[PDB]
Design a protein around this ligand. Structure first.
Ligand SMILES: Nc1ncnc2c1ncn2[C@@H]1O[C@H](COP(=O)(O)OP(=O)(O)OP(=O)(O)O)[C@@H](O)[C@H]1O
Ligand SMILES: Nc1ncnc2c1ncn2[C@@H]1O[C@H](COP(=O)(O)OP(=O)(O)OP(=O)(O)O)[C@@H](O)[C@H]1O
Ligand SMILES: [Mg+2]
Ligand SMILES: [Mg+2]
Lengths: 391, 244, 118, 384, 249, 284, 51, 236
């Protein structure tokens, strides 16, 4: 071979060895958090320490006895407790968690109920500023929503002047790519109510009856919350129709399907819980989660018109740098009846053709290519006729 | 009802294709090796029986070789039961042609007619195909000696040397290596026996497991002598070639 | 640029100011920002103020040379691009196909381009 | 060859780094400075001896929390609170005090063996143009995967949102697999790779939690590219039918819609999907704006194979005998994995010899073995 | 693909809709058809079709979708043309039969209705008459004609077995973009040439290639000249005179 | 003959005997046949002719001992022995490009093996090999590396002297010197042109950094201008703000009007004024 | 079995009669036989279909 | 049996026609180009297999009348049925209407033939596509038609079907001219040979050419002839 290979073999293995050695000798570090705006904490940190004032065994009430209480600890171990002098008796309720002394069990500080939910604190969501003007068109279907959901939060006066019961529920349905969830992110901007977002496939667990716990508790936590909205997303699985199999495994799923019914109507009403169901499909749903008194007005969300595509595309191309004198009308005509999510992608693929020609701008030429590009792939793909019949 | 249970076996696959044909071809590679080698002086058809027992009678057995007419014989490989029907249909067609023209059928016509019959079963009716492959040895004056193979699809191809049944590919390579453009019937016999000796599933190749027939221009001035040999003549030519 | 191996001359005022405690006086120095790289554009006898096309390659495969050299594959781009820095430094010439021959090669150099048309 | 000097030069930079590093640690890391001594002192004075790993269920905004320990008993713990009141969140591992349990501190990070499958230590020894050939349908995967990470500046001139997503589809062996692994060497951002046969499980309920996870990790590190190899595997692979079946497959797809785009607003997860069963996917999956430019791959043409075959035989020994052009003649619109299996099997002929020369004979012979594969699961011979 | 359907095992089976599924499918195969536009006035009926080239090697002046039934009835097919091949033969036969029996011109409606009787024969063997089809036809016709008793008529014949008399109708892929315009632009004061240029107008907008006489074809039915297919030269003249009035806006 | 394992290890040993020897001649004080680790001499007409003969053979198809001989001597003489052989081989025995890669691979690779006095002496020969070859584009780059004024003029002369007209040659010369934004080349080439005497107006500018002003304007027009500066009166916060406007207008930008308001210039004080006018300069 | 994923494929046949004697011989070292027993005789009494 | 082998698809199709088209894509490739006074059908034959008798085996171009040729791609077995029906119709025309067929009428007949096994019950379509070419009698216009298993018929200036027809079609856009055919027969032949060598490759023994000239002259050129033509193309 070549007269270096005999020693390239060794020189190269030396590279591999020394990288391991540098890393090993240098050592690593793993933070154990502190704070630079703190350098003294133990002047009365030791009062929280070392001289107990005290951390507490958490328990749960199982029996109020009228004039002591029975708690069963989390260490499963049952004890009889009473009232200290930071407790109020009016403030003990069934199933509430309490703190008791780690030595001689006595209630010191009651505590919020129910430690079993901990994965519903990650479905509580801050409102993304997708803005309320972000939604396409000035069409009227979103104005129906502003009558059911938004306005009674702002003004229950006019509904008190009417005296009607204000409608609470509404169905969001229609084709995808219409921005089903995109108008609900807008409405999350405006109303500034709590949004609690659910995934239907997130409601299915390994063992059955485990998701029954989930749904029930999620609802009651929302009852305590005031001025809240629960956004049922993608509940095509759990949420579907009820039927029998006689040997299925669908039964175990249908349990949590039922759990959704029994909380909506309840034996108590929804106290300012506005409810959205977002379904891709009306083709299969429950007839008691689609009964008209608990989903009150249901709004079909449609495909943009020949005007509606011009409005959406103007929101999109006003956001893009194009060189003036163009038609947003023309591009809508060229398209068949279609989604705006395509219109969101006519701009961006026309922009990849804009960078290809190395324009800072976008012109008519590159728009034409883009319109062809998407249509041709649509034909190559499902849902150019799929609606799964019904209206 | 009945549409319920209908299997639809004559439809295409996503391939554009017919599973039943493929499956028939698969089942014929479970059946015996049949070989046709064309010499310039005749044709050798050599077939290896599938069954062999020291209690089997192999002396009235012509399970693989059949005369369609006294110029055209076949080697049969596949389902025997289906093949029998086609054999008698073939003879009937031969006699029909002889009937209306008073002159012996060319090999062309017969091979094609049978191919059409097979084609009908795959084309329509919901029926399964006839799972047979034929090697036709024939003599006609127009093209002389003719060797043909046809398959359950209803397609035919002429060949200079061909093998069907078990180990098609192996015997084909062998024949490539050992073929001459012109040969004798003796040279052809030798090559045939040898090829079956290297492809036989039992360690030894024996006369009692060989069916062996020729059509020879020994007979002169435009006569051909068919011969379906006796196993005792097969024995002797098996010792000639030195296998036994 | 011509040599990436070369050390600068105008960029040394950027290099200069780290050994000294900060003052308003040093703040005066920093308004200078020279060290600049030209945007390469193809040239002619009448002076063309734009480029035509270029190839750029992020990852070479050659270790028989420290940087390798861009092979004839690169990502193609159009006119009007400043010299691309690290993560884009190997730059190949795209002018061959228009019946033009580069006179001034490119690797990622600062150098301007010039071409000859048949 | 002739790279010995540069490897010695790299090695030499390594010697100098190992040296100065080592001595710096050793004895002149001087902890005789008070901003080291005094900070650790009174940090250890509240910090344990046993540090009692706990699991934080939730926090209360009165400088307290409820922990549940894996040993058992819960506790209503205090917090020393030099640790930044609001820096700890459900799912944390917290250090409790061996006396009265107070949150001494907080561990920053912890991991699963199920995300070990997801994450990677690798650094491919192939970089692009070992995908040499098919070099214009690869501008659709380095102008919407590579480039907006490299330059957002270009997409700022035009403004509006930058690209998102690709689906790769075409024949098997046409490079789909290596395309994904080749952009990941260039970009040097967190490359997750997950097989679709692990997204299909024989247990339900944990299916969705796996799929939900991938993108939550992926958004958590600010740049990531998630390779889902084989999303064609979700309708053809299935175990039992009483914990697999329609149901399992439907849920996981549903989960992926929320994750892929949905309402999460998670971090950057550029997605790459390989598939050749694209019609077993939803219309809300192959919906635009999750696929922006979709790439079609078909078999190369005759002159494209010349590009492919020259890449593969550069690694091999050559002679003047070898002729690449006539190997191309024989093949007719076949995959580049077929070409790649001829060159691999050509050295298997050289291995068989124990002769280290590769010759035109070795390439032609393995050509016949490669064509033996194509037409001998066929039994027609000529098209019936 | 594989749109959810409970019934595709029968060809005459219900359907919690209450209607046949196969018929429904048939009407979704007219949306791939090449656009045929037809304007009916009280002065004649104009049938325009896009001949649809697919290659410049394809000779497109030897293919056409204008098909003569008889001197006083013309017909345009859109959808699946292999099915129309059979139907148009049947219709020609019917017309000749009427003239044999009665020495008289057949009503445009009676003819349309006969072919609708033809369309509904799919089945495995049911009602009093034998089913000689097994799957419904996927092709729709625009039957134009003139009879001396109701004047000019334009009928849309469906693969359903239903027929609607239109005053103008477009079918094919671009049928909706055309029909929106029909609703607005049509009236009963048109003249023959005005309707002719109107056809070329709406054919422009559903044009996926470019308008010229090599992928576009006109034909008329007029009372005293019968059914006449416009040759390509004449068509070219009209296209250019459209371009004159298009640059006058 | 037919590649196999054996010679892939044995043949390296043949070459290594000569290799080791030449290296050992610098380290030792015994030196070639008095060093007994090889017992062979590197001088004579017995082994020195073996090195040269080997070099021709290993050059033709490969590159093995060829780079390696040069540096072990430590002399630029060695590199010049190879110059002769290669410059014949530049076109016919293998392409120009392959040759260019050979030359630069020698210099870039051996840098940590070439202290300053050795390193420059090696780059001279490299310059000569290019000058022999067609690419005068390669010559200029390497001559700047050396830094010798003589060689800058030599590549400039190579295009200039042959032609009695402006041909591509003079445009190309002006470009080659233009590249250095140091401008040591620029001054040198401007005065060769006056001597040669063709058009002055285009050529001297093009050698100089004048034309580079022109193209910056073409690029600026595409880029645009942005102003986003703060401004508040009276303190270090005012001093900061007025500096910031130029810090956003680095390179040639258009901000004529902002400069024209001399108010804020005066509202900085002391040294602040100095740095305020200084940031105005960076706008242009 | 797609291209380049599998590159060596090893078929195993049922045993020969020489190979079947060779397995028998290994087993006889565990046992205590009598002299004069041929294991090529035993391998011919067998025909096997597997090891 | 009267049960359907044709089920309507909600896609706007029938699955079996799609599957048929695929079947026709797997078939050997045929090219058709008409000159000004000739027609040329070139066809690939797989003679890669050895010890094949080719004398007695019919070429993949079948004469259906004394002036009308048919070439095919797709299922070889199936095609023979179409071929018999067509020869029969050819004689019928002379019998009842007198004067050999015209290319168009015969094309129309074949179109109806393949169509019928779609629309009927108890039958599946043919996966076969034909190139029908020839002359009308008393005429000298070459007429080249293509029928496809959809039961749809077409006229073409030039056309190609079979395996990898797209490559050759692109070639034909660029080497055949809608305005001008190559006027000499030989040049036409060589244009089609040059076309065939795109995909067919691997020597000049797999190429077959039939040339038809009006006045009922159908002749097929043997391998020797082709060898000469090919080598000329090769040298140039
Ligand atoms: N009406 C609209 N106006 C403007 N933009 C829209 C609209 N609808 C959709 N979009 C754009 O398309 C993107 C994606 O659509 P989105 O994900 O909201 O679909 P979806 O309706 O939730 O469908 P699915 O839930 O079935 O997948 C949005 O982020 C937005 O950019
Ligand atoms: N167009 C090409 N250019 C360069 N190399 C190629 C090309 N196509 C294939 N190869 C080589 O063939 C290889 C085998 O490819 P790989 O296993 O990545 O193929 P694949 O298409 O991903 O296979 P599968 O169809 O099984 O998904 C690659 O690793 C690659 O080096
Ligand atoms: Mg949604
Ligand atoms: Mg793969």
């Amino acid at each position: 071979a070549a007269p270096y290979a005999a020693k390239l073999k060794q020189t190269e293995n030396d590279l591999k060895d020394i990288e391991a050695r540098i890393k090993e000798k240098a050592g690593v570090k793993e933070s154990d958090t502190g704070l630079a705006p703190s350098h003294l904490w133990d002047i009365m940190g030791d009062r929280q320490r070392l001289g107990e004032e005290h951390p507490l065994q958490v328990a749960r009430c199982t029996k109020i006895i009228k004039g002591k209480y029975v708690i069963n600890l989390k260490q499963i171990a049952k004890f009889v407790v009473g009232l200290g002098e930071r407790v109020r008796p009016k403030d003990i309720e069934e199933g509430m968690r309490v703190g008791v002394d780690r030595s001689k069990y006595n209630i010191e500080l009651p505590l919020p109920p129910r430690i079993d939910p901990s994965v519903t604190m990650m479905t509580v969501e801050e409102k993304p500023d997708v803005t309320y003007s972000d939604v396409g068109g000035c069409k009227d279907q979103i104005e129906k929503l502003r009558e059911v959901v938004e306005l009674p939060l702002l003004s229950p006066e006019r509904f008190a002047t009417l005296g009607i019961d204000p409608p609470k529920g509404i169905l969001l349905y229609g084709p995808p790519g219409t921005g089903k969830t995109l108008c609900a992110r807008a409405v999350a901007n405006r109303t500034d109510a709590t949004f609690i977002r659910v995934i239907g496939s997130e409601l299915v667990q390994k063992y059955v009856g485990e998701g029954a716990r989930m749904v029930r508790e999620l609802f009651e936590m929302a009852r305590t919350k005031k001025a809240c909205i629960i956004f049922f997303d993608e509940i095509d699985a759990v949420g579907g129709a009820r039927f029998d199999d006689g040997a299925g495994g669908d039964n175990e799923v249908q349990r949590t399907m039922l759990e959704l019914i029994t909380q909506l109507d309840g034996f108590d009403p929804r106290g300012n819980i506005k409810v959205m169901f977002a379904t891709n499909r009306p083709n299969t749903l429950d007839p008691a989660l689609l009964r008209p008194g608990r989903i009150d007005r249901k709004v079909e969300f449609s495909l943009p018109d020949l005007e509606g595509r011009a409005n959406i595309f103007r929101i999109h191309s006003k956001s893009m740098s194009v060189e003036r004198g163009i038609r947003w009308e023309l591009i809508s005509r060229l398209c068949p009846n279609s989604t705006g999510a395509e219109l969101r992608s006519v701009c961006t693929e026309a922009g990849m053709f804009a960078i290809r020609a190395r324009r800072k701008v976008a012109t008519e030429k590159d728009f034409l290519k883009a319109v062809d590009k998407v249509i041709s792939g649509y034909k190559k793909f499902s849902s150019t006729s799929r609606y799964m019949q019904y209206n | 009802g009945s549409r319920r249970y209908d299997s639809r076996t004559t439809i295409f696959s996503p391939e554009g294709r017919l599973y039943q044909v493929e499956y028939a071809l698969e089942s014929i590679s479970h059946a015996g090796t049949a070989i046709g080698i064309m010499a310039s002086d005749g044709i050798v058809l050599a077939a290896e029986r599938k069954v062999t027992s020291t209690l089997l009678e192999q002396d009235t057995s012509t399970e693989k070789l059949y005369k369609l007419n006294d110029k055209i014989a076949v080697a049969v490989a596949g389902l025997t039961a289906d093949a029998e029907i086609l054999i008698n249909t073939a003879r009937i067609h031969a006699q029909n042609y002889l009937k209306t023209y008073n002159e012996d059928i060319p090999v062309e016509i017969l091979v094609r007619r049978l191919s059409d019959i097979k084609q009908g079963y795959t084309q329509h009716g919901g029926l399964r195909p006839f799972g047979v492959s034929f090697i036709y040895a024939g003599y006609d004056d127009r093209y002389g000696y003719q060797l043909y193979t046809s398959n359950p699809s209803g397609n035919y191809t002429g060949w200079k040397a061909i093998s069907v049944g078990a180990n098609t590919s192996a015997a084909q390579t062998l024949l490539q290596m050992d073929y001459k453009d012109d040969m004798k019937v003796d040279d052809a016999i030798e090559l045939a026996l040898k090829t079956l000796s290297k492809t036989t599933d039992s360690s030894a190749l024996t006369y009692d497991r060989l069916e062996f027939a020729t059509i020879r221009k020994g007979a002169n001035d435009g006569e051909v002598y068919q011969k379906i040999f006796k196993p005792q003549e097969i024995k002797d030519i098996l010792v000639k070639t030195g296998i036994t | 640029g011509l040599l990436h191996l070369g050390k600068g001359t105008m960029t040394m005022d950027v290099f200069n100011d780290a050994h000294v405690l900060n003052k308003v006086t040093l703040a005066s120095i920093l308004t200078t920002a020279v060290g600049l790289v030209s945007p390469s554009f193809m040239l002619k006898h009448h002076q063309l103020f734009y480029m035509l096309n270029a190839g750029i390659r992020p990852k070479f495969i050659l270790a028989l040379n420290d940087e390798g050299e861009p092979i004839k594959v690169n990502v193609r781009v159009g006119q009007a691009v400043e010299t691309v820095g690290q993560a884009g430094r190997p730059k190949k010439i795209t002018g061959w196909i228009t019946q033009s021959t580069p006179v001034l090669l490119n690797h990622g150099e600062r150098a301007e381009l010039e071409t000859d048309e048949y | 060859r002739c790279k010995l000097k540069l490897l010695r030069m790299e090695r030499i930079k390594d010697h100098l780094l190992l040296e100065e590093e080592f001595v710096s640690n050793s004895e002149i890391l001087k902890p005789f400075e008070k901003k080291q001594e005094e900070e650790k002192k009174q940090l250890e004075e509240i910090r344990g001896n046993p540090l009692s790993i706990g699991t934080l269920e939730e926090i209360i905004d009165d400088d307290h929390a409820i922990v549940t320990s894996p040993t058992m008993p819960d506790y209503y713990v205090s917090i020393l609170s030099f640790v930044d009141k609001e820096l700890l969140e459900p799912g944390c591992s917290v250090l409790l005090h061996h006396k009265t349990m107070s949150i001494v501190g907080v561990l920053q990070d912890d991991a699963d063996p199920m995300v070990s499958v997801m994450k990677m230590d690798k650094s491919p020894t192939e970089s692009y143009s070992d995908i040499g050939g098919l070099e214009s349908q690869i501008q659709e995967i380095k102008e919407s995967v590579e480039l907006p990470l490299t330059h957002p500046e270009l997409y700022e001139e035009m403004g509006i949102k930058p690209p998102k997503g690709v689906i790769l589809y075409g024949a098997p062996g046409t490079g789909k697999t290596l395309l994904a692994k080749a952009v990941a060497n260039q970009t040097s951002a967190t490359f997750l790779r997950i097989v679709g046969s692990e997204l299909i499980q024989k247990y339900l309920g944990d299916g969705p939690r796996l799929c939900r996870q991938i993108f939550k990790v992926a958004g958590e590190n600010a740049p990531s590219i998630v390779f889902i190899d084989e999303i064609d595997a979700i309708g053809t692979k299935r175990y039992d039918s009483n914990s697999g079946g329609e149901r399992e497959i439907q849920r996981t797809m549903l989960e992926l819609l929320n994750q892929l785009d949905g309402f999460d607003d998670r971090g950057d997860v550029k997605v790459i999907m390989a598939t050749n069963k694209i019609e077993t996917l939803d219309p809300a999956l192959i919906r635009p704006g999750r696929i922006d430019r979709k790439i079609l791959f078909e078999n190369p043409d005759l002159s494209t194979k010349k590009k492919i075959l020259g890449i593969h035989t550069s690694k091999m020994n050559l002679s003047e005998d070898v002729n690449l052009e006539t190997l191309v003649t024989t093949k007719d619109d076949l995959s580049g994995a077929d070409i790649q299996a001829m060159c691999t099997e050509a050295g298997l002929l050289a291995l068989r010899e124990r002769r280290m020369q590769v010759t035109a004979e070795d390439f032609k012979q393995a050509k016949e073995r490669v064509m033996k594969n194509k037409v001998e699961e066929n039994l027609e011979g000529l098209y019936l | 693909f594989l749109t959810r359907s409970e019934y595709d095992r029968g060809v005459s089976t219900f359907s919690p809709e209450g209607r046949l599924f196969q018929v429904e499918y048939s009407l979704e195969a007219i949306k791939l058809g090449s656009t045929a536009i037809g304007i009916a006035t009280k002065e004649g009926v104009v049938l325009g079709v896009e001949k649809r080239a697919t290659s410049p090697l394809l000779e497109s002046d030897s293919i056409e979708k204008i098909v003569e039934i008889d001197r006083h009835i013309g017909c345009a097919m859109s959808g699946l043309t292999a099915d129309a091949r059979s139907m148009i033969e049947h219709a020609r036969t019917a017309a000749v039969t009427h003239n044999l029996y009665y020495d008289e011109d057949i009503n445009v409606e009676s003819l349309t209705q006969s072919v609708c009787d033809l369309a509904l024969r799919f089945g495995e063997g049911a009602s009093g008459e034998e089913r000689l089809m097994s799957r419904p036809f996927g092709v729709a016709l625009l039957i134009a004609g003139h009879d001396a008793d109701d004047g000019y008529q334009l009928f849309h014949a469906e693969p359903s077995g239903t027929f609607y008399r239109y005053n103008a109708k477009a079918i094919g892929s671009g049928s909706e973009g055309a029909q929106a315009e029909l609703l607005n632009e049509w009236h009963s004061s048109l003249t023959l040439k005005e309707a002719e240029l109107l056809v070329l107008k709406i054919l422009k907008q559903v044009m996926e290639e470019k308008l010229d006489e090599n992928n576009a074809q006109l034909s008329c039915i007029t009372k005293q000249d019968g059914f006449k297919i416009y040759d390509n030269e004449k068509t070219a003249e009209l296209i250019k005179e459209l371009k004159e009035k298009e640059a006058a806006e | 003959v037919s590649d196999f394992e054996g010679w892939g290890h044995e043949y390296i040993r043949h070459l290594a005997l000569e290799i080791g020897e030449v290296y050992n001649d610098q380290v030792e004080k015994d030196a070639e046949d008095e060093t007994s680790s090889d017992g062979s001499k590197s001088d004579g007409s017995a082994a020195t002719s073996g090195f040269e003969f080997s070099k021709e053979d290993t050059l033709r198809l490969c590159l093995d001992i060829v780079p390696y001989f040069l540096k072990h001597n430590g002399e630029e003489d060695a590199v010049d022995l190879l110059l002769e052989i290669e410059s014949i081989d530049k076109l016919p025995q293998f392409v120009d490009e392959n040759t260019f890669q050979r030359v630069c691979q020698y210099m870039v690779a051996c840098v940590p093996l070439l202290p300053p006095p050795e390193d420059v002496a090696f780059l001279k020969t490299a310059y000569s090999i290019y000058l022999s070859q067609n690419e005068l584009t390669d010559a200029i780059a390497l001559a700047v590396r050396l830094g010798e004024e003589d060689m800058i003029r030599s590549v400039f002369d190579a295009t200039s002297d042959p032609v009695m007209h402006k041909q591509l040659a003079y445009i190309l010369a002006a470009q080659k010197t233009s590249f250095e934004y140091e401008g040591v080349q620029d001054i040198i080439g401007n005065g060769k042109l006056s001597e040669h005497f063709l058009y002055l107006a285009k050529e001297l500018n093009l050698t100089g950094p004048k034309v580079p002003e022109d193209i910056y304007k073409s690029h600026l027009d595409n880029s645009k201008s942005v102003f986003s500066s703060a401004g508040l009166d009276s303190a270090q916060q005012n001093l900061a703000s007025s500096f910031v406007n130029g810090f956003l207008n680095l390179g040639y930008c258009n901000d004529k009007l902002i400069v024209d308001n001399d108010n804020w210039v005066y509202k900085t004080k002391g040294d602040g004024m100095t740095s305020a006018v200084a940031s105005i300069g960076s706008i242009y | 079995l797609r291209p380049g994923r599998i590159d060596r494929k090893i078929e195993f046949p049922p045993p020969s009669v020489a190979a079947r004697a060779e397995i028998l011989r290994i087993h006889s070292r565990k046992m205590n036989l009598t002299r004069g027993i041929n294991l090529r005789k035993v391998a011919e009494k067998m025909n096997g279909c597997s090891g | 049996y009267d049960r359907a082998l044709s089920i309507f698809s909600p896609d706007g199709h029938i699955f079996q026609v799609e599957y048929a088209l695929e079947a026709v894509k797997r078939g050997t490739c045929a090219v058709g180009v008409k000159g000004k006074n000739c027609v040329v059908l070139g066809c690939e034959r797989r003679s890669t297999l050895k010890l094949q008798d080719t004398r007695i085996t019919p070429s993949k171009v079948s004469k259906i009348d004394s002036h009308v040729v048919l070439s095919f791609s797709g299922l070889n077995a199936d095609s023979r049925i179409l071929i018999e029906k067509a020869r029969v119709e050819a004689q019928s025309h002379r019998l009842t209407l007198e004067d050999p067929v015209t290319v168009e009428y015969l094309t129309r007949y074949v179109a109806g033939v393949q169509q019928r096994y779609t629309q009927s019950g108890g039958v599946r379509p043919f996966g076969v596509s034909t190139l029908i070419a020839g002359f009308d009698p008393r005429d000298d216009e070459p007429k080249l038609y293509q029928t496809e298993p959809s039961g749809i018929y077409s006229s073409w200036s030039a056309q190609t079907i079979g395996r990898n027809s797209k490559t050759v079609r692109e070639f034909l856009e660029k080497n055949y001219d809608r305005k001008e055919p190559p006027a000499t027969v030989e040049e036409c032949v060589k244009l089609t040979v040059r076309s065939l060598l795109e995909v067919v490759q691997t020597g000049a023994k797999n190429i077959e050419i039939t040339v038809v000239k009006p006045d009922s002259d159908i002749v097929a050129l043997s391998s020797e002839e082709i060898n000469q033509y090919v080598t000329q193309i090769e040298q140039e």
